Amino acid sequence: ADGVGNSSGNWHCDSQWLGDRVITTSTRTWALPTYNNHLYKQISSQSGATNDNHYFGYSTPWGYFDFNRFHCHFSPRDWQRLINNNWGFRPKRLNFKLFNIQVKEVTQNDGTTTIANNLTSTVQVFTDSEYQLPYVLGSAHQGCLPPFPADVFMVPQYGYLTLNNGSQAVGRSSFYCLEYFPSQMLRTGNNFQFSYTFEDVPFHSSYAHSQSLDRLMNPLIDQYLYYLNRTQTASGTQQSRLLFSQAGPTSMSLQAKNWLPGPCYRQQRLSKQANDNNNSNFPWTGATKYHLNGRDSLVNPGPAMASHKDDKEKFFPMHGTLIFGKEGTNANNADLENVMITDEEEIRTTNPVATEQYGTVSNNLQNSNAGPTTGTVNHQGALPGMVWQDRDVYLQGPIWAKIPHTDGHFHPSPLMGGFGLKHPPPQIMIKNTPVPANPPTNFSAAKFASFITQYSTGQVSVEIEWELQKENSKRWNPEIQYTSNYNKSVNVDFTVDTNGVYSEPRPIGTRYLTRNL
Amino acid sequence: ADGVGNSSGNWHCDSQWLGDRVITTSTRTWALPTYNNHLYKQISSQSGATNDNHYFGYSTPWGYFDFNRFHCHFSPRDWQRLINNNWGFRPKRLNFKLFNIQVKEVTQNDGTTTIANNLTSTVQVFTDSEYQLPYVLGSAHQGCLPPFPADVFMVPQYGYLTLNNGSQAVGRSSFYCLEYFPSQMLRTGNNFQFSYTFEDVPFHSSYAHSQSLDRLMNPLIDQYLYYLNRTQTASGTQQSRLLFSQAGPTSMSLQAKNWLPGPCYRQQRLSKQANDNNNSNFPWTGATKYHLNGRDSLVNPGPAMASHKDDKEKFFPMHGTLIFGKEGTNANNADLENVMITDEEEIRTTNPVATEQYGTVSNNLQNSNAGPTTGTVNHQGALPGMVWQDRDVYLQGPIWAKIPHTDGHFHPSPLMGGFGLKHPPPQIMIKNTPVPANPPTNFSAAKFASFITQYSTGQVSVEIEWELQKENSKRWNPEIQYTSNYNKSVNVDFTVDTNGVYSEPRPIGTRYLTRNL
Amino acid sequence: ADGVGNSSGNWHCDSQWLGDRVITTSTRTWALPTYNNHLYKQISSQSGATNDNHYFGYSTPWGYFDFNRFHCHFSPRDWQRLINNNWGFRPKRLNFKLFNIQVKEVTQNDGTTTIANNLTSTVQVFTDSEYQLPYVLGSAHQGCLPPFPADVFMVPQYGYLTLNNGSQAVGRSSFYCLEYFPSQMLRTGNNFQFSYTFEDVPFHSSYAHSQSLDRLMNPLIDQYLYYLNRTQTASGTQQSRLLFSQAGPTSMSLQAKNWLPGPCYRQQRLSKQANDNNNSNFPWTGATKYHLNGRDSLVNPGPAMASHKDDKEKFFPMHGTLIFGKEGTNANNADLENVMITDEEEIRTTNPVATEQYGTVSNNLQNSNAGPTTGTVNHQGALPGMVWQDRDVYLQGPIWAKIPHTDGHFHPSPLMGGFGLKHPPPQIMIKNTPVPANPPTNFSAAKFASFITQYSTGQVSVEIEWELQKENSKRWNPEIQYTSNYNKSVNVDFTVDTNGVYSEPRPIGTRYLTRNL
Numbered sequence A, B, C: 001a002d003g004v005g006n007s008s009g010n011w012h013c014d015s016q017w018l019g020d021r022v023i024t025t026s027t028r029t030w031a032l033p034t035y036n037n038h039l040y041k042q043i044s045s046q047s048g049a050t051n052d053n054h055y056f057g058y059s060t061p062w063g064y065f066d067f068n069r070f071h072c073h074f075s076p077r078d079w080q081r082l083i084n085n086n087w088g089f090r091p092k093r094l095n096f097k098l099f100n101i102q103v104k105e106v107t108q109n110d111g112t113t114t115i116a117n118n119l120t121s122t123v124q125v126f127t128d129s130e131y132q133l134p135y136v137l138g139s140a141h142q143g144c145l146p147p148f149p150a151d152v153f154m155v156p157q158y159g160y161l162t163l164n165n166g167s168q169a170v171g172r173s174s175f176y177c178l179e180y181f182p183s184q185m186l187r188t189g190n191n192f193q194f195s196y197t198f199e200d201v202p203f204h205s206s207y208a209h210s211q212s213l214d215r216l217m218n219p220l221i222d223q224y225l226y227y228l229n230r231t232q233t234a235s236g237t238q239q240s241r242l243l244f245s246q247a248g249p250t251s252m253s254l255q256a257k258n259w260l261p262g263p264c265y266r267q268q269r270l271s272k273q274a275n276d277n278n279n280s281n282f283p284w285t286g287a288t289k290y291h292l293n294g295r296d297s298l299v300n301p302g303p304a305m306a307s308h309k310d311d312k313e314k315f316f317p318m319h320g321t322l323i324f325g326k327e328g329t330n331a332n333n334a335d336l337e338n339v340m341i342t343d344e345e346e347i348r349t350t351n352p353v354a355t356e357q358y359g360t361v362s363n364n365l366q367n368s369n370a371g372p373t374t375g376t377v378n379h380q381g382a383l384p385g386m387v388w389q390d391r392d393v394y395l396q397g398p399i400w401a402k403i404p405h406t407d408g409h410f411h412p413s414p415l416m417g418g419f420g421l422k423h424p425p426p427q428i429m430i431k432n433t434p435v436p437a438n439p440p441t442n443f444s445a446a447k448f449a450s451f452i453t454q455y456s457t458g459q460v461s462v463e464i465e466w467e468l469q470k471e472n473s474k475r476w477n478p479e480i481q482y483t484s485n486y487n488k489s490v491n492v493d494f495t496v497d498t499n500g501v502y503s504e505p506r507p508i509g510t511r512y513l514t515r516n517l
Helices: A076-085 A345-349 B076-083 B347-350 C074-083 C345-349
Strands: A016-017 A020-034 A041-044 A056-065 A086-109 A111-118 A122-130 A150-156 A157-161 A184-186 A194-196 A207-210 A227-234 A241-247 A269-271 A289-292 A296-298 A315-317 A323-325 A337-339 A359-362 A374-377 A386-388 A400-402 A419-421 A426-430 A454-468 A513-515 B016-017 B020-034 B041-044 B056-065 B086-109 B112-117 B123-130 B152-154 B155-164 B185-186 B192-197 B207-209 B224-233 B242-248 B267-272 B289-292 B295-298 B315-317 B321-324 B339-341 B358-361 B374-377 B400-402 B408-410 B419-421 B427-432 B452-469 B513-515 C015-019 C021-032 C041-044 C056-065 C086-109 C112-117 C125-127 C152-154 C157-162 C184-186 C192-197 C207-209 C225-230 C240-246 C270-271 C291-292 C295-298 C315-317 C324-327 C340-342 C359-362 C374-377 C400-402 C418-423 C427-432 C454-470 C513-517
Touching: A020 A426, A076 A086, A076 A454, A076 A513, A086 A122, A086 A426, A086 A513, A194 B016, A207 A345, A345 B185, A426 A454, B020 B076, B020 B242, B076 B513, B086 B123, B086 B427, B086 B513, B207 B347, B224 C240, B321 C359, B339 B400, B427 B452, C021 C074, C021 C427, C056 C400, C074 C086, C074 C454, C074 C513, C086 C125, C086 C427, C207 C345, C427 C454
Parallel strands: A020 A150, A207 A513, A400 A419, B020 B152, B207 B513, B400 B419, C021 C152, C207 C513, C400 C418
Antiparallel strands: A016 A020, A020 A454, A041 A056, A056 A157, A056 A426, A086 A111, A086 A194, A086 A454, A122 A184, A122 A426, A227 A241, A269 A315, A289 A296, A323 A337, A359 A374, A359 B289, A386 B408, B016 B020, B020 B452, B041 B056, B056 B155, B056 B427, B086 B112, B086 B192, B086 B452, B123 B185, B123 B427, B224 B242, B267 B315, B289 B295, B321 B339, B358 B374, C015 C021, C021 C454, C041 C056, C056 C157, C056 C427, C086 C112, C086 C192, C086 C454, C125 C184, C125 C427, C225 C240, C270 C315, C291 C295, C324 C340, C359 C374
C-alpha cells in the first residue's frame, strides 16, 4: 500500500516503563537467503551415528524469526531496572512487524558479482497461529535476533524432525509442506503485522529467599512435640532404652517440620580448578541421562537444583546448568575460561544441591540381632509437602517454551528456564518466492531447476508488554543489587570494542531481591 | 475509650453448634514480660555445634500470640462431638481480641519486691496482615494458649532466623525491626481487635476407609482380563511356557487394578517392648533424613504413612509420628511411658506402611540364561494413579501451617498435620513500650540503658468459626466412637487433679467414622 | 507520500524582515556517507598522549546536522541590516526539513566506479528532543552548513566522549546506542520535519557603550563626599597628617563610585608585529589555563575581557579571543596573516582588559614603622557591584550553546559567544540504513560484515525566526556603521572568485550602534 518509494515502517527500538508494566520494543535488520534451492529435502542421520544420535526429518526452503532470547527485548540497563526493583515479571502481549522489504537479484559473471533491485519480486510470510507445524522455537537454537540493535542478522532456516527407526522413517512420520498454508505475499512496499496475547502464566521469581526451608522455626522457643533422642541408655551399662526429648534451639535438625525440599535427579560434580577432576573422559559415561525408546538422552540442565552448597563455589554440576560463551568463543572444544557457566546458588534454601543426595531412608527392619541399615536416595520424585523453585532466567536465554501436548504433565515449567506456554508465540515463517529463469521455447513437463538467484532484506520490529511485580519488602538492611564495577578498565562491559564487536561479559540472572519463605 | 475504671471486654469462652457450623471461643489471661531489655539482639549457634545445627538470627523484644493448637479452641467434649458426628471440618473465619490490659511496674529494694499499677504506661500491638515478617507459627512451638481456660500463660518471645553460613551470616540475610511497622498503642482502657477470613481449604478427613485400596473389586465375579499365571509348564518335564488365567475371588492379589498406593519415604521401625530393639544408639544415624545445603535435617514426621501393618501395633516408625507427652513429663530424655505416641493406623487402606518398602521392581532383562532379578523400592515419588490420605489432626496439635511462597509445591498439606494456608492467620505481635528511668540532668547522646521495670497482663479472646461436613453413611452396623471408660478411677480423664493440674491422658485423633473408597 | 517521481520539497532560501522580527531561511544540499562500516567503535587517546589530552569515547555510524554558525542563517547583507539598525536580537523558533532524498548505491569494478539509484533503500532520521544523548553541538566544530547557499556539504559523523582514567574507561562511562531510539525511516519520496521553540533568553548586545564605567559622573559638579587627599603634610617639615578634599572635575579617578568592572582571569599579551614577542615557545607554558581532575585545560577564549586598551591595537590576548581563518588557510601552523583574529575592543567601558591586572589591594597593616605595601590582583571573581558585558557574536560563530545540567552556574553565557540554552535546539541524527549483500546459502549466526556500498544525498531547510530590539538613541551626531569600502579591488568582498570559491574577508561583529550605561 506504498510502492517503490515509500517506507512501510519506522524504526522503534525504545523501552517504556509505566511502573506496573514495561513495554520493550526492538527493531532489527535481517537478510533472508534462498535455502536449499527452493526445495523440501528429507534429512537423516548418517551411517556410523550412534543409536542415540539418529534422526529423520525434513529441511524446508522457509526461514523463520526467533525473538525467544531475553536480550533481544532488553538492554543490559533495562534488565538491571527489572531485576533490581522487582519480585517478578511475566509477558502480557506482543506485536510483530516486517517492513521496508527489499528483494535483491544477484548475477555472477567472471569474478564480478552484481546485485540489483528486483522490484516486482515477492517474499512470502505466514505466522502459524493454530500450531499445526512442528514447533522448533523452544530448543534454544541460534538465529535469534541479536543482542545489539545495530547488528544485522541472517534469518535461520526452518526444518523439523519426526519419528525415526534408526536413520529410517516409520509410517507415522509426518511430512509438512509449508506451501500448503495461506501466506501473505509482499513486494517492496508491502508490510506484515500480527498481534499475540500471552495466556495467564505465573510471574517468574526475581527474588531469592531470606530463609532456608529448614530454618522456618522460632529460634527462641522449644517445640511441644517430642522426638526420639536416645535409642540406648545414656550412661552405665549400655542397654536398649527409648528416650524422648523436645527439640529446640540447640538441635534444629531434630525438630518436626511441615515441608520437604524439592525433587532431585542427581548430577556429577565438576571442579573448576584444573587437575581436581578425575583423569578419564566421562562427559557421556558418567552422565545423568534419561532413556526413551532405546536412546539415552543426556539430562540437561534438568530439574532445578542448587549448583553447589555453601563455600563450594569452585564446583558445578556436570550438565546441570546453563553454559553460555564469550564473544568470539570457538564452537567446539572451548576452554573453561571461554564459556560462562551460570549458577543456581540462590535456590539452596529450597531445592536440593544437584550434586548431593536427596537424603537417606532405612532399607531394613532392625531387631536386637539386626542393626539398622539405611540407603541413600540419589533421585526423588514428588512427595507430598515438597516446595521448590524453578530455574532462573538470564539476560541471555529462553523466554518461553511450548508445553508438549500430552495427556498429563507435572509442573510444566521449562527446564532451561522461561515460561511454559500451551499456546506460545506462533512461528513466523518467511521465504523468497521462486523466480524462474527463462523457460525453453518448447514445452517440457519437467519441473524447473533453473531459478534467478535472489535474496531479500528488510526490517523487523518486536514489541512485548511485560507485567511487573513490585518489591514490598520490610527488611531494614540494604539488599544485593546488580551493579557495574567502578574500577577502570580497557573496555566498558556490555559495550562494543575498538573493532565494533558487541560482547556480554557475564550471564546476568534475575534473582537479587530477597523474600521470606 | 474507657479509662481506668471501665472494663474493655467480657469473658466469652462458650462453644456454639448450629449443626452446619460450630463457633468456638476461648478467652484466656496472659502475662507479657520485657524481653531482652527492649533490645534486638542477633543470635547464632555456638562453636562446637554440628554443621546441621548452625543457625543465624535475631531475637526481638516483641512477644506474640499463638492459638494454633486445637485444644485451645475445643474442649474434650466439644472435640468428641466433632469427631464422632462428622466426616470433615475446616475453619471459616476468626475474630481476635485483647482487652482489660494492665501494665504493672516492679521495684525491688532489699529482698522486698513491690508491684504497682502504672496507669499511663502503654503496650504496643500490631498484627502482620501482609506477611512481611518471618512467620514462625507453623513450627509447633510452645507458648500457645493453654488447653484449660483457667490457666494463665506467658506470652512467648518472638525471634526469627535467616540465611547462615556456619554460624555467620551472608549478604542476603534480612534484618527486620518490628518497630518499623505501624502498631496500635494501648493504655489500660484501650482494647485491640481484628478479623480474619480463612481461604478456601479442603475439609479435613474425619473418617477412616471401610475398604482397602486393593479390595475395591467384586468378590463374587471374575475379571474378563487375563494375567500371566505360569511362566513354566505345570507338570511333566519342566519347560518354559506362558500360561494365562483370569483373576477372580481366589486370587485377588493378581487382578488388574486402577490405582496405586500413595508415595513413601521409608522409616526405621521401633518396638515399644524393651530389648526388642537393637542395642546401639541410632536415632540420628539410622534415621531417614533429607539434605539441604550441606545440612542433614531429620524427616519428622514426614510423608503420611501408616504406622504399622495388621497386628503389629507394638511397633512404631522412628521419627515418623507425632509424639506428645504427659503432664509433668521431663523435657529431656523422657521414658517411653511418659510420652504419648500417636498412630496413623487408619490410613492402612491407602497409604503405605512407614516401615515397609513401597514395593518391588525388576532390575534386569531376563533371558533363558539370565534369571529375573528384582529390586526393592524403599522410596517412591508420585506416580500416576496414586491416591493417599493426609496425616490426621489431634486435639493437641497444629491447626494450620503457612505454605512456603515458592514457584512450585506438591500437594501442600502440612506434614505435621492441619491446613496449609498461603495466607494463614496473621501474627499478632505485642511488647511493652519502654519507659525510661530518670535521665541525667546534662545532655548525653548515648542511648538509654536505664528503664523502669514493668510487665503487662490482660485478657485475650479468640473466636473461630468452623464448617462441618455431616456423616451420610448407610452402613447397617454401628460405628466406632470415641468414648470414655466407665470403670472407676482415681482421676477423671481430661480433668484437674487434687493439686489443680489439668492433664490430657491420650492424644485423641479425629478419625472414627468410616467411609467407602 | 510522494513516490519516485514527485519532489518532497521546494527550495526556500529567502530572508524576511517584518521589522519587529526577521525570519531567515536556508536550504542546502548535503551528502551523507556510510561511517565506519555501520559500526559503533570505541575510540580513545593513544599511548604517548599527554595526561591533558587523554580521552575515551565512541564513534557512531550516525551523522548529524549542525546549523549553529550564524552565517548559515544570514547573508552578509542581512547581517549588516541587523547589526547596523538594532540594539539586540534573540532567536524565537525554528523549523527544520529534510526532503528530496536520494540513496545511491556504488559499485567498483577494475578502476571504473558506477553509481545508481537504489529506490527502495532507506535513510534513518531522529531528532533528540529529550536531550538523552551527549550534546556535541556547542563545541564549535566543522561540518556546519556552508556560508554560501550554492555549496554542497558533507554531513559530519557523530561521536561522543565519556569519563576516562588515562586512555581507559571507568565504570560510570556511558555507552549510547543510537539505534535504541525511535527514528523515522525514509525512502525517496519521504520527507522529515520538526519544529522547535527557543526558551526565553536575553537579547544579545548589538551595541557598544557611549560611556566608560568610571566616567558616569557629572563633569561640572563636585561631590559632597570627601576622600583622603593627603596622608602627609603638604609643605614644611614632613609630618603625618590626614587631609580630606572633595573630588571633582580635576580628579575623576578619586571620586566615589557605585560600580566595579567585571571579573577578570588574566591573559598573556601578544604583539602582532614580528619580533616584539619573546623568543621562546610558550603557547602552552605561558598560558592561562584551568585544572580539572589532574588535567590542565587551556582557557579559551575565557571570561569576556577587552582585547586591548587605548591605542594598543597591535596587541591581542593569547588564547583570549576567537580566531577564524581565511579561505584556503592551512589547518596546521598557519601564519598570522592567514588567520582572522577578532577583537573585544567595544567592552573597554565595562570589562577589564584581558592582559591587564584587575586592580590592586593592600597586603599589610601599615604603621609608623611599617610602610604600606599593596598586591596586584591578576584574577578576580564576582564582587557585589560588578557590571560587565558578554563576548560579542560574529557572522562566523556559535549561535548557541547548551548550558550544562548542574546544581549551580554563574551567569550561564557561553564563553565563545551566543545564547546559553538549557534546552537548546535538539540534535538531528541521520544514517544510511544497512543493506546486506547476498547471504550465504547455509545459515551462519555470525553478524554480517558484508554490505552494499551506498550513500545518500538530499536537501535540508532551516528556518529561524529572530526577534529584534530597535535602536531608540537620541544622540545628535552620526554613528559608526558597518560599511563596504568604495575603492576598487580585484575581488568583491563576501563573494566568489574567478574559480568559484566563496570567501569571507573579515570577522564582522555585531556591535556598532551605541548606548549609554
